[PDB]
């Protein structure tokens, strides 16, 4: 028992459907380093988000495919974390160390930038403008504490510095993940779907048309595992679409590849910086800039940098930075998501408000028009409804903001034949405008909040109901004490599947046994049969008493 306890964290077990119809268990060794790195908190948050979106979108048909894709992305993040782990050559090594430090401390730089923005606005809270020179009004700092203006200038410069550092840090740690995901998706598309071979991508696919640049570039397999996807595509579609066409489209040289398959050479690379800058792929960098400019967070950070420079120019611009708390705090982000869940509804509701206000102005510009004077003095009357642009402006500026409608502003119609007419007009206006539309505005937000709360509740219950791999009622396992728990914890653990895949990739091909060889190649074929859907050893050997 002792050695079993000692090796308990390192002993991994998985279950496969098998070549026959009997479920078979495979035992392997789990890397402790990989386990700890999987138990690092960023991966934990990433997998919480992954399972949240999988439960929210259902994805029952391709759930296993989603898990496999997540595992591949997580392995790429594993490689990233391994790279980030702790004259010309000196500056290059200092540059890479600085980039690694910014990648490690990207979040701290964001929090420091927020703190300095708050400090700058607190310094700006003391500014007084005096008409007299401290003849036009002169903004200045009215305070008794010395060197507050130099302190504000130093904080401005430091904040801009921090913003720059944040830009570089984000460019360091976030871009390679999106580039890897795009390259993997494009490789799958052009290998199995063939969106460029015997087919053309959709015009509405902006990224589909943007990815046509790196079709012939030699840097297409960069930042991605498979460096021969184009090779497989040629070996799969050359006899149909035309080998010359495939060759020109996907940029491989038959002579070069064949001579390297016979015997390749090892030429010396010139270490010149000029020839390195000439060997930098221009088209691949253009495509990378095109894909990175479509990202939301990169544009947000670039806007933050631009606003920092604007603040340095005019101090008042710094105020805008305050809005960064909506993304720095989480509850503010959730509430703003609840608000923007029904953004389409709100804009068309206020459009209906504008339409009905225009209809009221139309039906008021011909009748009750006399009751549109707002000048107390009798010598200079002030008609506010002589024409409809001014009458509509008056109505939408005053009647909406004023509680009770526009009747209060409009002249009392008593002693006049139009008394009842205008009374009804005001009643209808108040009831239809002030009440109903604001009721819709209230209900949309309340319904969005309730909708997201219900989404969280169903995500919780789904995450805790009928296992994951099998999707079978807990009751059966519950018959045995801690049955469902044990089933999900050991038999079909998602971390166990991930560890088994990682082990297969890590170990050599010559050391694989028959079952793991089968699983490895069959996985390479993108088929997911191995997953034992709705089956376990308890069911398989219930007669055998397992």
Residues belonging to the binding site for ATP are 44-48, 463-468, 488-494
Q: If we measure between CA atoms, which residue out of 164, 167, 128, 125 comes closest to residue 318?
A: 125
Q: Which is nearer to its own copies, 131 or 203 (CB)?
A: 131
Span from 219-227, 389-397, 417-425, 484-492 in contact with Zn ion (CB under 5 A) = 484-492
Alpha-carbon distance of 480 to 546, in angstroms, equals 13
Q: Does position 113 bind Zn ion by CB under 5 A?
A: no
Q: If we measure between CA atoms, which residue out of 368, 372, 414, 416 comes closest to residue 393?
A: 372
Q: Does position 366 bind its own copies by CB under 8 A?
A: yes
Q: Which is nearer to Zn ion, 215 or 472 (CB)?
A: 472
Q: Which helix (H) or strand (E) holds 364?
A: helix 343-365
Q: Which is nearer to ligand ATP, 390 or 540 (CB)?
A: 540
Select the residue interacting with ligand ATP from 357, 488, 504, 530 (CB under 6 A).
488
Span from 188-196, 313-321, 353-361, 466-474 in contact with ligand ATP (CB under 6 A) = 466-474
Torsion angle, alpha carbons of 345, 347, 352, 355, to 10: -170
Show Cβ contacts of residue 67 under 8 Å, excluding neighbours closer than 6 positions. Answer: 54, 494, 497
Residue with the two structure tokens 């048309």: 209
Per CB under 6 A, contacts with ligand CFF among 76-135 are 76
Span from 37-45, 72-80, 96-104, 151-159 in contact with ligand CFF (CB under 6 A) = 72-80
Count of Cβ atoms closer than 10 Å to residue 197 Cβ: 21
State the number of CA atoms in the 13 A half-sphere of 293 facing the CB.
8
Do 532 and 14 contact (CB within 8 A), yes or no? Answer: no
CB of 532 to ligand ATP, least distance (A): 11
Using CB distances below 5 to 8 A depending on partner kind, what does residue 297 bind out of its own copies, ligand CFF, ligand ATP, none?
none
Show Cβ contacts of residue 295 under 8 Å, excluding neighbours closer than 6 positions. Answer: 178
Span from 160-168, 179-187, 407-415, 489-497 in contact with ligand ATP (CB under 6 A) = 489-497
Select the residue interacting with its own copies from 206, 240, 259, 427 (CB under 8 A).
427
Q: Which residues are annotated as a binding site for Ca(2+)?
A: 510
Span from 69-77, 171-179, 393-401, 491-499 in contact with its own copies (CB under 8 A) = 393-401
* Residue 535 backbone dihedrals phi, psi, to 5 degrees: -150, 145
What distances in angstroms separate CA 9 from CA 13, 26, 30, 31, one per listed residue? Answer: 11, 16, 7, 9
Handedness of CA 201, 206, 209, 212 (dihedral sign): negative
Q: Which is nearer to its own copies, 272 or 471 (CB)?
A: 471
Q: Which helix (H) or strand (E) holds 26?
A: strand 24-29
Q: Does position 505 bind ligand CFF by CB under 6 A?
A: yes
Alpha-carbon distance of 358 to 347, in angstroms, equals 16
Select the residue interacting with its own copies from 348, 463, 505, 527 (CB under 8 A).
348
Select the residue interacting with its own copies from 405, 410, 488, 519 (CB under 8 A).
405
Query: x/- contact string, 212-231, with ligand CFF (CB under 6 A)?
Result: -------------x------
Using CB distances below 5 to 8 A depending on partner kind, what does residue 225 bind out of its own copies, ligand CFF, Zn ion, none?
ligand CFF
Interface contacts to ligand ATP, rule CB under 6 A = 44, 48, 463-464, 467-469, 488, 492-494
Interface contacts to ligand CFF, rule CB under 6 A = 72, 75-76, 225, 505, 524
């Amino acid at each position: 028992e002792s050695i079993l306890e000692y090796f308990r964290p390192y002993l991994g077990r998985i279950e496969i459907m098998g070549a026959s119809r009997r479920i078979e268990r495979i035992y392997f060794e789990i890397s402790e380093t990989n386990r700890a790195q999987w138990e690092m908190p960023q991966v934990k948050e990433s997998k919480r988000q992954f399972i949240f979106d999988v439960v929210n979108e259902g994805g029952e048909a391709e759930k296993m495919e989603l898990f496999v894709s997540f595992c591949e992305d997580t392995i790429f993040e594993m490689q990233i974390a391994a790279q980030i782990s702790e004259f010309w050559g000196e500056l290059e090594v200092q540059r890479v160390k600085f980039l690694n430090y910014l990648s490690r401390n990207f979040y701290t730089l964001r929090f420091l930038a927020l703190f300095l923005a708050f400090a700058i606005n607190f310094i700006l809270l003391f500014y007084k403008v005096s008409d007299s020179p401290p003849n036009m009004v002169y903004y200045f700092l009215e305070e008794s504490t010395g060197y507050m203006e130099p302190a504000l200038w130093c904080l401005s410069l430091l904040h801009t510095l921090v913003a720059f550092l944040c830009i570089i840090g984000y460019n360091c740690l976030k871009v390679p993940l999106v580039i890897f995901k795009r390259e993997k998706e494009l490789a799958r598309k052009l290998e199995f779907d063939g969106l460029y071979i015997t087919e053309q991508p959709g015009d509405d696919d902006v990224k589909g048309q943007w990815d046509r640049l790196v079709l012939n570039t030699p840097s297409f397999p960069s930042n991605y595992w498979d460096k021969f996807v184009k090779r497989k595509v040629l070996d799969k579609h050359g006899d149909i679409f035309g080998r010359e066409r495939i060759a020109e489209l996907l940029g491989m040289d038959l002579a070069s590849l064949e001579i390297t398959a016979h015997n390749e050479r090892k030429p010396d690379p010139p270490p010149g910086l000029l020839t390195w800058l000439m060997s930098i792929d221009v088209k691949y960098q253009i495509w990378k800039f095109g894909v990175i400019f479509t990202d939301n967070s990169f544009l947000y950070l670039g806007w933050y940098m631009v606003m920092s420079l604007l603040g340095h120019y005019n101090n008042f611009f710094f105020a805008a930075h305050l809005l960064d708390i909506a993304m720095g705090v989480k509850t503010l982000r959730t509430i703003l998501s609840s608000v923007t869940h029904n953004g389409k509804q709100l804009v068309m509701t206020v459009g209906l408000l504008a339409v009905v206000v225009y209809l009221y102005t139309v039906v008021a510009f011909n009748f009750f028009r006399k009751f549109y004077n707002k000048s107390e003095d009798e010598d200079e009357p002030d008609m506010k409804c002589d024409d409809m642009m001014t009458c509509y402006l008056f109505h939408m500026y005053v009647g909406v903001r004023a509680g009770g409608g526009i009747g209060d502003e409009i002249e009392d119609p008593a002693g006049d034949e139009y008394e009842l007419y205008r009374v009804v007009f005001d009643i209808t206006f108040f009831f239809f405008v002030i009440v109903i539309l604001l009721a819709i505005i209230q209900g949309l937000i309340i319904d969005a909040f309730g909708e997201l709360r219900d989404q969280q509740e169903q995500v919780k219950e789904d995450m805790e109901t009928k296992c994951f791999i099998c999707g079978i009622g807990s009751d059966y396992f519950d018959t045995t004490p801690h049955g469902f728990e044990t089933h999900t914890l050991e038999e079909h653990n998602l971390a166990n599947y991930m560890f088994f895949l990682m082990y297969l990739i890590n170990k050599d091909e010559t050391e694989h046994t028959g079952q793991e060889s089968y699983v490895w190649k069959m996985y390479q074929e993108r088929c997911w049969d191995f997953f034992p859907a709705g089956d376990c050893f308890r069911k398989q050997y219930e007669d055998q008493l397992s």
